[PDB]
């Protein structure tokens, strides 16, 4: 369960 806020290459907002 990677942290979405840490990810800068993928949109955190769900579809």
């Amino acid at each position, epitope marked *: 369960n*990677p*942290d979405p*806020n*840490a*990810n*800068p*290459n993928v*949109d955190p907002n769900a579809n």
Partner: antibody
Amino acid sequence: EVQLVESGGGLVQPGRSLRLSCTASGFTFGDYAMSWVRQAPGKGLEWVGFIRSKANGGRTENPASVKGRFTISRDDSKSIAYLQMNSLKTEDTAVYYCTRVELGSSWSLGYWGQGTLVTVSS
Amino acid sequence: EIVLTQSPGTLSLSPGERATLSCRASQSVSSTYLAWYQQKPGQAPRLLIYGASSRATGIPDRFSGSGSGTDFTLTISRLEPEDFAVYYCQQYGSSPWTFGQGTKVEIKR
């Protein structure tokens, strides 16, 4: 060749504001996340925020130490990344590096600018 | 917040020796989200290795990395004179992003 040039640093009194600029060249700016890292004199590296590419929402993320005080934006028209710094205190004195976030599964800081010095003193 | 503790603070070696730099994390992080940087005095940091087994472009083969979960290692197989500098580990799989306090590799006399 990937190039990152920081500008807009220098001396500023406590409480005032200052905006740092990062002009990019040698790559497609709009496709990459950009991130700011600062280094206090004689100390280590501290991440002070990144901004995603507009194809990934274009939103930002900031640490608690500068949250509500620092603001990161981008201008894909001119390939410039900005660091808006408000309510500067003496602890914000540091060399501020502009970095490009690498694409893919492992988003490391692949390229760094030479850095610009910001001194917060009265 | 995940804290990266680097050890030792200062590595006193000589050219030709092997350099083993450690970086321990307060929480278990994936190797894909761990990177190592090199900084010489007065110069910007540069990326060396990142992820499970990725090397930055133009980085010599003597730099390598390994580790799983909580203990990671940056290894310089045979130290060159240009390798004496400060090395920071970084995690970016957990917000906020954090760096280690840095390990200095100095010339032994």
